[PDB]
């Protein structure tokens, strides 16, 4: 049968939808991840944790690509994000690659993903996902943007933000380092320095995942010879390069 079509999100007798509050707790049990928005790029960073010392963090992806020019990174539950990134990609393709053809604006896509969060707080047999996403991107219309998607199903633009267990400390860190004008390089230094205080293990560049949605790079597209068309503004930094960056904090 099917008798689970009663929502598993409810209100509490003291107001405040209780289920999404619990789901927001799981983010404070999650890993720390942060995004600093520059005025000529965006940087996102997260820490890799595994349950084994024989585990490969070379086939572990916590920063994932949605479209060349837009990246995402989570804090919270792994499994939840693993399915949710696939649904983000799927709606972006079915509603903006088969209808509007080109890669969406950042603002558009953020709204669309928040609708799926919303539709896991409406129906039975589904309770919501317990991660928060930072979706960094650039469109040529609204410029650089950094957004944060809630487990409530809302979005917020931020100037700089963190999510994870060390989020509260991190936004206090960013207060004094932040400035309305930043370079992309300086952003890298600020981002990794804040995340060093939100990791209580050892802080390597082999176990720290770095990505920029900064400079275009054409040769990562797959072809060259038309410069009006580029390749990905997303660019993941390999490990040895990140090690160079640890020295640049």
């Amino acid at each position: 049968t099917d008798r689970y079509s009663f929502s598993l999100t409810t209100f509490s007798p003291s107001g405040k939808l209780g289920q999404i509050d619990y789901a927001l707790t799981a983010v404070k049990q999650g890993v720390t991840s942060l995004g600093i928005k520059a005025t000529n790029g965006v940087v996102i960073a997260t820490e890799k944790k595994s349950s084994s010392p024989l585990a490969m963090s070379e086939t572990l992806s916590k920063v994932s690509l949605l479209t060349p020019d837009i990246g995402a990174v989570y804090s919270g539950m792994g499994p939840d994000y693993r399915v949710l990134v696939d649904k983000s990609r799927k709606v972006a393709h079915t509603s903006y690659k088969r209808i509007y053809g080109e890669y969406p604006p950042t603002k558009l896509l953020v709204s669309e993903v928040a609708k799926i969060m919303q539709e896991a707080t409406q129906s039975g047999g589904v309770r919501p996902f317990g991660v928060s996403l930072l979706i960094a991107g650039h469109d040529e219309f609204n410029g650089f943007s950094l957004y944060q998607v809630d487990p409530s199903g809302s979005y917020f633009p931020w100037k700089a933000t963190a999510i994870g267990k060390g989020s509260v400390a991190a936004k206090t860190f960013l207060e004094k380092r932040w400035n309305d004008e930043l370079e992309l390089e300086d952003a890298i230094h600020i981002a990794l320095l804040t995340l060093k205080e939100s990791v209580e293990g050892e802080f390597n560049g082999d176990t720290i995942e770095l990505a920029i949605i900064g400079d275009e790079n054409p040769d990562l597209l797959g072809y060259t010879g038309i410069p009006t068309d580029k390749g990905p503004r997303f660019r993941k930094l390999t490990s040895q390069e990140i090690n160079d960056r640890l020295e640049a904090l």
Binding site: S61, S64, L65, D86, R89, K90, H93, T94, K97, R98, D219, L221, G222, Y223, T224, G225, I226
Partner: protein
């Protein structure tokens, strides 16, 4: 149109023309007939144009997904397999005459696919209405294990023969060279063999040489404050 694809040991080359005809009417002098299922998997299309374009849109999305899921280069035959199944249940009411080319880490590949859902392999294939004219020239000069430069030429010349003996082939010849273990090189307008001859006098007239009835202004620039 005409599409040639030549497979050889070290890679594959797919070339096409830019003349778009609807009927004997030429729709476009210039149009890109090279399409992208994926960034390594290029094709070009003949027959009816809307059907080729639609199905590469549709399968481009599915492959793009797959490429994200594996996070590495998409296999050519994935595209092949999906096209075939799609077309087979219409039974070829969707006219897609595609030459599907691509490279991947299990070698060079070259396929053709028909409306009904037939697939062929070869070390060279040709499709469209000008396929026939292309054939002949290829089969004389072709050898096992061509050089990339040599292959370039031979491709472009084959399309050239299409221009001269086929009426769906014309304006520009573009080439895309896809080599194993590198980036695909899109050589647009590799050979431009036809210019509009010069005219002998310019066609201006002074104003109102066409009569005008009335006029109005019409604003889209926005909306209005007061």
């Amino acid at each position: 149109t005409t599409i040639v694809g030549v497979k050889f040991n070290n890679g594959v080359v797919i070339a096409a023309d830019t003349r778009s005809t609807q009927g004997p009417i030429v729709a476009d002098k210039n149009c890109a007939k090279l399409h992208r299922i994926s960034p390594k998997i290029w094709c070009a299309g003949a027959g009816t144009a809307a059907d080729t374009e639609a199905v590469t849109q549709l399968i481009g999305s599915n492959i793009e997904l797959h490429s994200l899921y594996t996070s590495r280069e998409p296999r050519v035959v994935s595209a092949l397999q999906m096209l075939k199944q799609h077309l087979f249940k219409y039974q070829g009411h969707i006219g897609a005459y595609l030459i599907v080319a691509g490279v991947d880490p299990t070698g060079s590949h070259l396929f053709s696919i028909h409306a009904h859902g037939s697939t062929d392999v070869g070390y060279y294939l040709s499709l469209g209405s000008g396929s026939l004219a292309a054939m002949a020239v290829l089969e004389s000069h072709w050898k096992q294990d061509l050089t990339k430069e040599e292959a370039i030429k031979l491709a472009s010349d084959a399309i050239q023969a299409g221009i001269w003996n086929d009426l769906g082939s014309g304006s520009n010849v573009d080439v895309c060279v896809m080599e194993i273990g590198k980036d695909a090189e899109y050589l647009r307008n590799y050979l431009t063999p036809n210019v509009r001859e010069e005219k002998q006098k310019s066609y201006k007239f002074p104003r109102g040489t066409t009569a005008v009835l009335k006029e109005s202004i019409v604003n889209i620039c926005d909306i209005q404050e007061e």
